[PDB]
Coordinates of C-alpha atoms in Angstrom, one line a residue:
Chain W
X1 CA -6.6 7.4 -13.0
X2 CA -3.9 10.1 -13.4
X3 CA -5.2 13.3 -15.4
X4 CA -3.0 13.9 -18.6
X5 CA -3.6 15.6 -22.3
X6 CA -5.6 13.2 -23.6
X7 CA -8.5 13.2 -20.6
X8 CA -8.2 17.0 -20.5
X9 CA -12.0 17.8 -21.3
X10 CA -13.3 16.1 -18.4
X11 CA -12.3 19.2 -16.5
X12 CA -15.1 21.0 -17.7
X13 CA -17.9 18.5 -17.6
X14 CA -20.5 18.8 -15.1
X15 CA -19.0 16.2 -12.1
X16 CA -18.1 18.8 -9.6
X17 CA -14.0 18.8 -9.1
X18 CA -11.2 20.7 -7.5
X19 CA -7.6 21.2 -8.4
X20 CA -5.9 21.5 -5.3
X21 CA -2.3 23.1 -5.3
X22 CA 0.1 23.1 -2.2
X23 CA 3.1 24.2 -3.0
X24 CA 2.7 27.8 -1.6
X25 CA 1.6 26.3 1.7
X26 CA 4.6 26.5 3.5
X27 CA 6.9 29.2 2.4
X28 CA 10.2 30.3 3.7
X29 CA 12.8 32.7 3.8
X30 CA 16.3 31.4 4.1
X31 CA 19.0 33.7 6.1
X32 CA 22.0 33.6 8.0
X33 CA 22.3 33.2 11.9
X34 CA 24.1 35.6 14.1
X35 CA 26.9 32.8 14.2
X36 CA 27.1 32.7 10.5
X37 CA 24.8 29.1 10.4
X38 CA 21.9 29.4 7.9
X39 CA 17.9 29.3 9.2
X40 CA 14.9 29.9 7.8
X41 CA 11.8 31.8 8.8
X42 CA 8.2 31.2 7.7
X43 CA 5.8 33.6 6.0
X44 CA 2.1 33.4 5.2
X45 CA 1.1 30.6 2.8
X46 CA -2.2 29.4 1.1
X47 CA -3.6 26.5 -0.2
X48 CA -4.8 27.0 -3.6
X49 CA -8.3 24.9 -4.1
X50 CA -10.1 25.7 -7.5
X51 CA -13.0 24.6 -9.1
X52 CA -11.6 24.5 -13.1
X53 CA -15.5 24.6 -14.4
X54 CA -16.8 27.8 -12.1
X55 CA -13.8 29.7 -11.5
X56 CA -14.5 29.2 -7.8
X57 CA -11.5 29.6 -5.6
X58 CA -11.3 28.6 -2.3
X59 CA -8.1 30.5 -0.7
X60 CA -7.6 29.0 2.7
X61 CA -4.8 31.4 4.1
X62 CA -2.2 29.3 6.1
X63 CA -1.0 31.5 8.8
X64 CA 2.8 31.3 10.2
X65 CA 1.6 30.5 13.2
X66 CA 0.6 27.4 12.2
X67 CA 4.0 26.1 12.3
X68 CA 5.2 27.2 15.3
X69 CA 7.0 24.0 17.6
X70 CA 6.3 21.7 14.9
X71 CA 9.4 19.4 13.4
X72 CA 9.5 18.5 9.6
X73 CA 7.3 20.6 8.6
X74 CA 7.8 20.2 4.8
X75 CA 6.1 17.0 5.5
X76 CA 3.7 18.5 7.9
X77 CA 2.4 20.9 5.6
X78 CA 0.9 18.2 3.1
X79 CA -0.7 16.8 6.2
X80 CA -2.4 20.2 7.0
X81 CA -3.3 20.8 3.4
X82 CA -5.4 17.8 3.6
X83 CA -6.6 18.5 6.8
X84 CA -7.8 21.8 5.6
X85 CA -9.5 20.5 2.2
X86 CA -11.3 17.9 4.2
X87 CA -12.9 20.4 6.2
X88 CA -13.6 22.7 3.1
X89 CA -15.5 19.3 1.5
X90 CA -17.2 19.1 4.9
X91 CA -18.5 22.4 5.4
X92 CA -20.2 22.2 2.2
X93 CA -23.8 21.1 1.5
X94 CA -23.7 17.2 0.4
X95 CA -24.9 18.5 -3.7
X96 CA -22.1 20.9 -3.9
X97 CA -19.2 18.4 -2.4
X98 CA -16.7 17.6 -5.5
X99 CA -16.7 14.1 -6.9
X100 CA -13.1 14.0 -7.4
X101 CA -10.3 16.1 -6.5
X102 CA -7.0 16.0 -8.5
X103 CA -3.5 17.0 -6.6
X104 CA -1.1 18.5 -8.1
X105 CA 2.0 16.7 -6.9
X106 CA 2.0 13.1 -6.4
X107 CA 2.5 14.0 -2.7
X108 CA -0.5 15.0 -1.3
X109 CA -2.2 11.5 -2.4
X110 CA -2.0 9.7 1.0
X111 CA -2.6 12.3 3.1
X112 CA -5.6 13.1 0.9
X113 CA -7.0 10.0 0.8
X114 CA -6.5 9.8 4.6
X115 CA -7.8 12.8 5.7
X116 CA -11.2 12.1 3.1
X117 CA -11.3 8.2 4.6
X118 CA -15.3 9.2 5.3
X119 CA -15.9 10.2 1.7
X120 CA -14.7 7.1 0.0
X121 CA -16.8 7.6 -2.8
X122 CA -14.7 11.3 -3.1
X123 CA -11.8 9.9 -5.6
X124 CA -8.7 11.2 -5.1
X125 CA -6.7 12.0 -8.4
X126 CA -3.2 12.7 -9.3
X127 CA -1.9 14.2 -12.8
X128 CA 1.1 14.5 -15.3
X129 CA 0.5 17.8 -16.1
X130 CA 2.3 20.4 -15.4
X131 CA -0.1 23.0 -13.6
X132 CA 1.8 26.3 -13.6
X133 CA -0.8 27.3 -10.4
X134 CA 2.5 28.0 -8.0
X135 CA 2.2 31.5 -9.4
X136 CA -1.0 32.6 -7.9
X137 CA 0.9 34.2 -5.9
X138 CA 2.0 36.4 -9.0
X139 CA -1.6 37.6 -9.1
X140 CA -1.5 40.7 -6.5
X141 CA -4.5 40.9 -5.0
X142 CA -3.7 36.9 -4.2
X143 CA -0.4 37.7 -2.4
X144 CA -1.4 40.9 -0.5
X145 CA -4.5 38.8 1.3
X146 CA -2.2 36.4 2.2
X147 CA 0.5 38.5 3.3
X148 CA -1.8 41.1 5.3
X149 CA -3.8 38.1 7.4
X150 CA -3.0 37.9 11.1
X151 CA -5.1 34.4 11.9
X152 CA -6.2 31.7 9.5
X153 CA -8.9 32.5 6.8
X154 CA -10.4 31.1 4.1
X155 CA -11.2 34.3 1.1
X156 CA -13.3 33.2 -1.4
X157 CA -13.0 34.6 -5.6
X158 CA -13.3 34.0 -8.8
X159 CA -10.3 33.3 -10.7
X160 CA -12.1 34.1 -13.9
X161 CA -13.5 37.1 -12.9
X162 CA -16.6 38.0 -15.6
X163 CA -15.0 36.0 -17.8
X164 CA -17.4 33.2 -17.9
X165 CA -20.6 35.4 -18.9
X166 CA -18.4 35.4 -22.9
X167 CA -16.4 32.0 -22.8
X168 CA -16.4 28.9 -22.4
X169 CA -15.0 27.4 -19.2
X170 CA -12.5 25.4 -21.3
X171 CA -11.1 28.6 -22.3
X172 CA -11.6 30.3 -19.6
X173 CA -8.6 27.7 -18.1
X174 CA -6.9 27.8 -21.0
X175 CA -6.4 31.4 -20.5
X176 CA -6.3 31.2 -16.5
X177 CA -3.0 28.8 -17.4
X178 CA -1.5 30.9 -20.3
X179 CA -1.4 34.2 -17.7
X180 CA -0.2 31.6 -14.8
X181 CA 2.6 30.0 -17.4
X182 CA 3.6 33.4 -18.4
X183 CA 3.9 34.9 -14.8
X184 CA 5.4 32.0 -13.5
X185 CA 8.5 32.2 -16.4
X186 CA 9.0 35.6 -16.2
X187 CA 6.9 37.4 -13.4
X188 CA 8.4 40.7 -14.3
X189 CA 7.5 40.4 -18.0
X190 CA 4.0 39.2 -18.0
X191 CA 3.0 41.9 -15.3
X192 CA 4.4 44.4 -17.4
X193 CA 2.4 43.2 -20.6
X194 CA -1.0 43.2 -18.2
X195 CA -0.6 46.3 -16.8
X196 CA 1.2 48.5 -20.1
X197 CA -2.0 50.2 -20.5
X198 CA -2.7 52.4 -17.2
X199 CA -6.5 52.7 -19.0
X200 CA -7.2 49.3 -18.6
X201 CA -8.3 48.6 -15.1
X202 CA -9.1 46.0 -12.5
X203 CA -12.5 46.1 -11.3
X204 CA -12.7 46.0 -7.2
X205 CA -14.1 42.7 -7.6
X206 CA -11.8 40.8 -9.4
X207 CA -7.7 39.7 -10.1
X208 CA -7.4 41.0 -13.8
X209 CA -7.8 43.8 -16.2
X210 CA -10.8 44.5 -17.5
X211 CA -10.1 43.5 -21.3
X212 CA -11.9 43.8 -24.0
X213 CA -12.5 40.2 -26.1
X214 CA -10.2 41.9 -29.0
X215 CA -7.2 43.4 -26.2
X216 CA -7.6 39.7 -24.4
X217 CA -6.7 38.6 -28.2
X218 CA -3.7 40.7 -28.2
X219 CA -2.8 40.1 -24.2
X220 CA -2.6 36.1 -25.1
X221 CA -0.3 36.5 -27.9
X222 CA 2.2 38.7 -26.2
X223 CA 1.8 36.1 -23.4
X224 CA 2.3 33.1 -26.0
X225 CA 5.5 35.4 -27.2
X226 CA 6.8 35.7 -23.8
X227 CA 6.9 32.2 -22.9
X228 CA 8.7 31.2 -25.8
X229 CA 11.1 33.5 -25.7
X230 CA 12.3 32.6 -22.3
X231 CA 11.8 29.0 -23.0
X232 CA 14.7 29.5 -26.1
X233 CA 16.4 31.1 -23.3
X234 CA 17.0 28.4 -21.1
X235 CA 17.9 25.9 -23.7
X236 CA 20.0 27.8 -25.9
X237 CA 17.3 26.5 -29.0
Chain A
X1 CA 6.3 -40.6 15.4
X2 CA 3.8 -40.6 13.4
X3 CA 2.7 -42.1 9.4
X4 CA 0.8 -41.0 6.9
X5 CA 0.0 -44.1 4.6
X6 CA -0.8 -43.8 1.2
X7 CA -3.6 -45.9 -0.6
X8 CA -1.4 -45.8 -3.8
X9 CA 0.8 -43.5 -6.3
X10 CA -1.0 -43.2 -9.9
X11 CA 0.3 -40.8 -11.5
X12 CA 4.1 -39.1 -11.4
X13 CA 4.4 -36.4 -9.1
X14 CA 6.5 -34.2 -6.6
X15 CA 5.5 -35.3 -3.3
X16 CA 6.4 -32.2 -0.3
X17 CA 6.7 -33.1 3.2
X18 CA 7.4 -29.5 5.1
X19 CA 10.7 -28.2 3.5
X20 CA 11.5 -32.0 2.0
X21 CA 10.1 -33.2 -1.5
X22 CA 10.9 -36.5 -3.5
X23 CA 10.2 -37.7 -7.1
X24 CA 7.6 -40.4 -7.5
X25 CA 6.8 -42.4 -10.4
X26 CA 3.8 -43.1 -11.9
X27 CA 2.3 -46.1 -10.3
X28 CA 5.2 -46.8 -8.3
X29 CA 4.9 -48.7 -5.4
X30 CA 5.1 -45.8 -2.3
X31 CA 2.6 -46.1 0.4
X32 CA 3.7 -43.2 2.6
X33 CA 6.1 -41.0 4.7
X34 CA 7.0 -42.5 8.4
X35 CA 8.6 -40.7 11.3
X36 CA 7.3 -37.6 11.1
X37 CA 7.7 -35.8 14.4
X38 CA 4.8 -35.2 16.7
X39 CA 4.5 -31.9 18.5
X40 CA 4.0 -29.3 15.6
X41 CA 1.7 -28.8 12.5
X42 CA 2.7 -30.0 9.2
X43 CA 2.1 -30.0 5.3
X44 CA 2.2 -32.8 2.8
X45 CA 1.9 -30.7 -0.8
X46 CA 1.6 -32.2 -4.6
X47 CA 2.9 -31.1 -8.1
X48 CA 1.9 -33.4 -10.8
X49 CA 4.6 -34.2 -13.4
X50 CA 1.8 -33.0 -16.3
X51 CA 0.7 -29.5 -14.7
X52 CA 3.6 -27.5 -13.0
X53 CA 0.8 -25.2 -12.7
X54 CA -1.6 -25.6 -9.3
X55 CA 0.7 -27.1 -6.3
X56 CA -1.7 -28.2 -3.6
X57 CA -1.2 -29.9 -0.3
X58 CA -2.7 -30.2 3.2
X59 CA -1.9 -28.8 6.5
X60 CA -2.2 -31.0 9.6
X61 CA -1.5 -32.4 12.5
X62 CA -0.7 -36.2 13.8
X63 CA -2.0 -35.6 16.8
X64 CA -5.3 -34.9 15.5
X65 CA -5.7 -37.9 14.2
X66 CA -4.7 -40.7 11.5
X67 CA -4.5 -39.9 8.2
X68 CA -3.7 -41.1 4.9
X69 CA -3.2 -40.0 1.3
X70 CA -5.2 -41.5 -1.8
X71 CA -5.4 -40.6 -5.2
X72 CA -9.1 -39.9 -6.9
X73 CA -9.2 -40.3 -10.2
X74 CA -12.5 -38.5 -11.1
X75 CA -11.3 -35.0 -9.4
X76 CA -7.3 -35.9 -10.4
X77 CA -5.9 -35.1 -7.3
X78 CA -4.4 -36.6 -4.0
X79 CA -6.6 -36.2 -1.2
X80 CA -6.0 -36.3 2.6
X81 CA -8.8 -38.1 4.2
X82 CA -9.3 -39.1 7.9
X83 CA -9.4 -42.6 9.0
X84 CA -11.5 -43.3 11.9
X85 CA -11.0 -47.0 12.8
X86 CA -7.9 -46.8 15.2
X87 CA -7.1 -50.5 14.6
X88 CA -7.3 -50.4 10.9
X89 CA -4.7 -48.4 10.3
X90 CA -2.0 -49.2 12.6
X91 CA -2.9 -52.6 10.6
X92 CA -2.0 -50.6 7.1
X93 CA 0.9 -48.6 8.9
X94 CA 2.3 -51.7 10.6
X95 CA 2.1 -53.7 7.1
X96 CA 3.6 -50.8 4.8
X97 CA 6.8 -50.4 7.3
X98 CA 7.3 -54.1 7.5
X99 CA 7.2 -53.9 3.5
X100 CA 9.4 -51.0 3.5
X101 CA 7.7 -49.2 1.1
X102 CA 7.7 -45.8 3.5
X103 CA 9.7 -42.7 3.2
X104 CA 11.5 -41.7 6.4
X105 CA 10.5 -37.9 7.6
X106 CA 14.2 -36.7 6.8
X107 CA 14.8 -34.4 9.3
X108 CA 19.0 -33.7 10.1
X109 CA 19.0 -33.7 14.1
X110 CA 20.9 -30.5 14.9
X111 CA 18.3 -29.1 12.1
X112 CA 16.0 -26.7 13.9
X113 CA 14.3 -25.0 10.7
X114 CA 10.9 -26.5 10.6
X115 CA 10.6 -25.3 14.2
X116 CA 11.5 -22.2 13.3
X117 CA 9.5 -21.7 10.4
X118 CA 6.4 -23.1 12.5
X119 CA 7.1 -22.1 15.8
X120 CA 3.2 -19.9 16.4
X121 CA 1.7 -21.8 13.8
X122 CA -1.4 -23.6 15.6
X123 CA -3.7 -26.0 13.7
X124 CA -6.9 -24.6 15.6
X125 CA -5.7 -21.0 13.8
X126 CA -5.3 -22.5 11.1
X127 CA -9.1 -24.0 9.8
X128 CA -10.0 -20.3 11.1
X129 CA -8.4 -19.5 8.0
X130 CA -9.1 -22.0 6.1
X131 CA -12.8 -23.0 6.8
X132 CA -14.0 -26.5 6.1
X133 CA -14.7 -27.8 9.4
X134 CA -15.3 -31.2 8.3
X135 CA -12.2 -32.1 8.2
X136 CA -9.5 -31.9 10.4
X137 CA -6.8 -30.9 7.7
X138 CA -7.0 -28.1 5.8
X139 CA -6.5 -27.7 1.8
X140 CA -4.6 -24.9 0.5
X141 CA -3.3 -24.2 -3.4
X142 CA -1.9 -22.0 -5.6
X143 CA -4.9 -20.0 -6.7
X144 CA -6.8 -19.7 -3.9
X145 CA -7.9 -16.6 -2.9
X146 CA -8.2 -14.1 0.3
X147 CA -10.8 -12.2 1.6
X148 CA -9.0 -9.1 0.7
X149 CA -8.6 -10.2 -2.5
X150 CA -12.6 -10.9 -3.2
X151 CA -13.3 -7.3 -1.8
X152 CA -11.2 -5.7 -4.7
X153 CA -15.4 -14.9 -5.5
X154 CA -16.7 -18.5 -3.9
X155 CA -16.2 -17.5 -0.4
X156 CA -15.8 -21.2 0.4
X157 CA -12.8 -21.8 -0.6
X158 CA -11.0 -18.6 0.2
X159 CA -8.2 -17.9 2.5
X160 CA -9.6 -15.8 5.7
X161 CA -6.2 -13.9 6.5
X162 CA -6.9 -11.1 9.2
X163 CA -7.8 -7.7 7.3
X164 CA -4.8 -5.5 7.3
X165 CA -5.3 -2.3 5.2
X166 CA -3.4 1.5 6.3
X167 CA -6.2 3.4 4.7
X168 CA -8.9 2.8 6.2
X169 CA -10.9 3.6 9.5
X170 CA -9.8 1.1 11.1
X171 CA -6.0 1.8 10.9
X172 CA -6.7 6.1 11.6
X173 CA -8.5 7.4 14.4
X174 CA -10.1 10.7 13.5
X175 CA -8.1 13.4 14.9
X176 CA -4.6 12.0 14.5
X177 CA -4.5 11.1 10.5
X178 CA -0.7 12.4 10.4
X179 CA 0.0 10.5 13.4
X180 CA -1.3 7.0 13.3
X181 CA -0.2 6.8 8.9
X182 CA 3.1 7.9 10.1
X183 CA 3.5 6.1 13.3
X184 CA 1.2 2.7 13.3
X185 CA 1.7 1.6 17.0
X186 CA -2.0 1.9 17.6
X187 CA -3.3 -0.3 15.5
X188 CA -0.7 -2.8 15.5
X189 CA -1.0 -2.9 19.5
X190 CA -4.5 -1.5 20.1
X191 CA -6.6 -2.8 16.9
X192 CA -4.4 -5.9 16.2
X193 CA -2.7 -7.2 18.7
X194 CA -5.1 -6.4 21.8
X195 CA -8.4 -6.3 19.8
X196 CA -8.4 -9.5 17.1
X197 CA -5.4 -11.5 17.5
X198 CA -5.5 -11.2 21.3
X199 CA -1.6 -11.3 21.6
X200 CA 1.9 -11.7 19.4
X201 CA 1.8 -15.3 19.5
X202 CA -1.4 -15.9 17.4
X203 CA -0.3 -12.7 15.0
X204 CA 3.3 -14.4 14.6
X205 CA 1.3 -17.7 13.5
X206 CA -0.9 -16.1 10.8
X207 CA 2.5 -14.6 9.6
X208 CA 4.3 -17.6 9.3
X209 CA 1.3 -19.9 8.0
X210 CA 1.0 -16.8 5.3
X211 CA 4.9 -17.3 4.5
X212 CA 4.9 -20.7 4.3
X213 CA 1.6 -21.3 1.7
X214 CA 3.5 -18.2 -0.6
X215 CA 6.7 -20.4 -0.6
X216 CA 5.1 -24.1 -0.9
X217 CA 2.3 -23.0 -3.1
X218 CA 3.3 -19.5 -4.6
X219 CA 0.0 -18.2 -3.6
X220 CA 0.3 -14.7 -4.3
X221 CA -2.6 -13.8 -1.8
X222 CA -0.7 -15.0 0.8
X223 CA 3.0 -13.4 0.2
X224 CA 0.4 -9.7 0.4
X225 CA -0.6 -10.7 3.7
X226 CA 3.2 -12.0 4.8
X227 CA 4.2 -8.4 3.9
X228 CA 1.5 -6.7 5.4
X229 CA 2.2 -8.0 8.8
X230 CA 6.0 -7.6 8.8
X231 CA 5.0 -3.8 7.1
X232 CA 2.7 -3.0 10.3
X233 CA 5.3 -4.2 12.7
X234 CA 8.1 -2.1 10.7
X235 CA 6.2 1.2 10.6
X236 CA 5.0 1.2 14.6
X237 CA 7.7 3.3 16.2
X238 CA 6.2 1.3 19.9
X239 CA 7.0 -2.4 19.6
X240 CA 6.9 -4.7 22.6
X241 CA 11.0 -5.5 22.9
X242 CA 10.1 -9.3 22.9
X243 CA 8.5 -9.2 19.5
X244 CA 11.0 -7.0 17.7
X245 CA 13.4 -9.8 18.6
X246 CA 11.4 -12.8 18.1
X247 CA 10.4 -11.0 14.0
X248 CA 14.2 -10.9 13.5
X249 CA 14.0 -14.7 14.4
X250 CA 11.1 -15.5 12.2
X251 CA 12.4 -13.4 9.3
X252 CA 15.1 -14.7 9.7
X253 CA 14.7 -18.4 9.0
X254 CA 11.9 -17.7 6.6
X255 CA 14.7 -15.8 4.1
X256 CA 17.0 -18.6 4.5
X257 CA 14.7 -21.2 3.5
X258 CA 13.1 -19.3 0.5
X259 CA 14.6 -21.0 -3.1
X260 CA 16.9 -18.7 -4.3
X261 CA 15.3 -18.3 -7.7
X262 CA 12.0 -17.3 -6.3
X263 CA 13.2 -14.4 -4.7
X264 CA 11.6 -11.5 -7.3
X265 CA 8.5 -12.9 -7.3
X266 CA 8.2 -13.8 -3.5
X267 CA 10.2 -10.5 -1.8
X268 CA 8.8 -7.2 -2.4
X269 CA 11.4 -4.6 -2.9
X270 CA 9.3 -1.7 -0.9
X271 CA 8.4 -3.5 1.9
X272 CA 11.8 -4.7 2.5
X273 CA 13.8 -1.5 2.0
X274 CA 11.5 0.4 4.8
X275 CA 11.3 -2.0 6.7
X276 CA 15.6 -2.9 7.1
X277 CA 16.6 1.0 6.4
X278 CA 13.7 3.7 6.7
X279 CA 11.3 2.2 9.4
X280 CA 11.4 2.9 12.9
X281 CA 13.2 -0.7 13.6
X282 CA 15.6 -0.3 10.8
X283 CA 17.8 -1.5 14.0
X284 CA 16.2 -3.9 14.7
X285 CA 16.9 -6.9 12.6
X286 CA 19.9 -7.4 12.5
X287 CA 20.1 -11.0 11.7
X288 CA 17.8 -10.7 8.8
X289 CA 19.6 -7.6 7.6
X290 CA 22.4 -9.5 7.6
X291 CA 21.4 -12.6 5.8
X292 CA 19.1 -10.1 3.6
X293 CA 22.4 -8.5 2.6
X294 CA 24.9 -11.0 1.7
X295 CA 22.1 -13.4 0.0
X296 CA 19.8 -10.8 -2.0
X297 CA 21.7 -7.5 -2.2
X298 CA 20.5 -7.0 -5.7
X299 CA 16.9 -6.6 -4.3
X300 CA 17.7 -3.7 -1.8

């Protein structure tokens, strides 16, 4: 059924599962027309596809082009998501193909479970939770692939980075979703808090700083202090 | 015209007769309903005075032979049972009238409804259905099941509706996911209609027949498949003209013969609000929009 708090730990079990997050597939721009009417114009999107348990990202970049003559695409876009995390299942050998795959908005169910009609024993998952994985395109190195690609591609990380060889994979979401929250409620703020320190540097091979386990200590609690704050902010608490 | 005698009346119950029922009393003399009219199916149905749980009844048809109601006691139910001896019973029928212990068939003359609730409904489709092919009735009841149903248990006494399901291969041909779930004109005129119905006629049918055993027997197996069928019709964008009208018709009669206090239960609220206001034949039933409207607005 639907993925809440109380299931939670079956994220990090051993059944092979992806979170798959559509909501900066189709992006936009919205402007005004010569004649003073109001259009929009596309830019470069992405589905987000991520294996919570590995850290594996599978970044298929969804080029403008894409659109181009196509009608309601808002809907459309769902349908190509699908399309496109079909053929990701597809190209990969049968032991490494997920057993479930969880959505994260109720929308993508049926054209999900449409597109994966030949893998019915593939169960397709919604959840209440409140995934803050819009902002992946907060994380830099995320955004400039995207941005930069002339043609459709598919880049491949790991959102953990190293992480993994120290922590759990429980925590290793738990702090993937603390940065993500963070940048999400105040993109300006939680950049500044990761990057402060111009000693601490990214390696070439991954997303984030490369933290020591007692500056992650300290980078999480500013983090857990930002999104507080801003969550008094917008309810006058 | 035809009669259906019946050996006797034990026990009080709610005899049905198509869209007609009367009260009859335990051991009461009644031995039968007389001038029912030849030319379309029909269904004789039961509710026992002690168990408003289970209505039962038989589909048939007079001209496919005589037949007669009893009442066995061991299984506690009235049966329909065929009676091969031509003479026999026009002797029983001929007796009972002259007796007047018959019901007339009470069927209003300007009164087309039966017609119109039965108009595709063919007997031959009909033990396709419901498979027990030695008899020439056919039983139906409340809790029977579908074959749809026992995929999600005896498969002899299940109701063989046609398979409708929009996720599955069947409905989607790979390549055009978006296209077919959106728009379901291929497999309502390719799969359906030309592959396993053959044409409208024999799909109308198995959506009436699926109406009718939801309202006499609130089979709940059998309102799914109702909705199905008016659901594939409502989300093909590519209807043939004549069956876009002829639905409306159907519908039509079928809403205004429902009991108005079963409407929760027996109309589902989705189906119905896509099908009069979102689908591609919003437009298109207009008579059953209209007596939808001013009969159940509180379900739309």
């Amino acid at each position: 059924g639907a993925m809440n708090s109380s299931n939670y730990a079956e994220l990090f079990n051993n059944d092979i599962k992806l979170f798959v997050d559509d909501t900066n597939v189709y992006r936009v721009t919205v402007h005004k027309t010569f004649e003073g009417n109001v259009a929009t114009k596309a830019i470069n999107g992405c589905i987000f596809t991520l294996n919570p348990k590995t850290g594996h990202l599978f970044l298929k970049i969804i080029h403008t082009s894409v659109w181009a003559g196509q009608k309601r695409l808002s809907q459309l876009a769902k349908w190509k998501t699908a399309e496109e995390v079909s053929a990701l299942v597809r190209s990969l050998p049968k032991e490494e193909q997920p057993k479930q795959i969880i959505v994260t908005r109720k929308a993508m169910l049926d054209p999900l479970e449409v597109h994966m009609l030949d893998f019915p024993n593939i169960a397709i998952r919604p959840t209440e939770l409140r995934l803050p994985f819009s902002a992946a395109m907060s994380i830099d190195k995320l955004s400039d692939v995207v941005m930069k690609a002339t043609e459709p591609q598919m880049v491949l990380f790991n959102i953990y980075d190293d992480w993994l060889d120290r922590i759990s994979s429980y925590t290793a979401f738990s702090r993937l979703t603390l940065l993500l929250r963070a940048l999400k409620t105040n993109e300006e703020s939680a950049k500044m808090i990761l990057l402060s320190d111009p000693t601490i540097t990214i390696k070439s091979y991954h997303l984030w700083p490369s933290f020591t386990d007692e500056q992650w200590i300290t980078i999480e609690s500013q983090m857990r202090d930002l999104i507080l704050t801003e969550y008094g902010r917008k309810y006058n608490v | 015209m035809n009669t259906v005698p019946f050996t006797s009346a034990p026990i009080e119950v709610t005899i049905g007769i198509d869209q007609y029922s009367f009260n009859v009393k335990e051991n009461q003399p009644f031995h039968g309903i007389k001038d029912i009219p030849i030319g379309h199916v029909h269904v004789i149905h039961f509710q026992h005075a002690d168990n408003s749980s289970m209505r039962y009844g038989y589909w048939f048809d007079c001209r496919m032979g005589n037949f007669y109601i009893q009442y066995d006691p061991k299984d506690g139910l009235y049966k329909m049972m065929e009676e091969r001896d031509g003479a026999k019973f026009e002797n029983i029928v001929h007796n009972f009238k002259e007796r007047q212990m018959m019901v007339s068939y009470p069927k209003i003359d300007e009164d087309d409804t039966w017609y119109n609730l039965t108009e595709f409904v063919q007997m031959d489709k009909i033990r396709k259905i419901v498979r027990k092919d030695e008899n020439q009735f056919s039983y139906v009841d409340s809790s029977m099941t579908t074959v749809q149903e026992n995929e999600l248990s005896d498969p002899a006494h299940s109701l063989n509706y046609t398979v409708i399901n929009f996720k599955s291969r069947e409905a989607i041909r790979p390549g055009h996911e978006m296209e077919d779930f959106l728009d379901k004109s291929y497999y309502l005129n390719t799969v359906m209609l030309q592959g396993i119905f053959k044409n409208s006629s024999n799909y109308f049918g198995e959506l009436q027949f699926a109406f009718l055993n939801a309202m006499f027997f609130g089979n709940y197996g059998s309102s799914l498949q109702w909705h199905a069928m008016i659901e594939l019709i409502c989300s093909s964008a590519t209807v043939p003209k004549h069956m876009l009208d002829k639905l409306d018709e159907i519908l039509y009669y079928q809403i205004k013969t429902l009991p108005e206090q079963y409407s929760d239960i027996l109309l589902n609220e989705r189906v119905w609000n896509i099908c009069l206001y979102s689908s591609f034949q919003k437009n298109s039933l207009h008579n059953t929009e209209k007596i939808m409207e001013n009969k159940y607005p509180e379900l739309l």
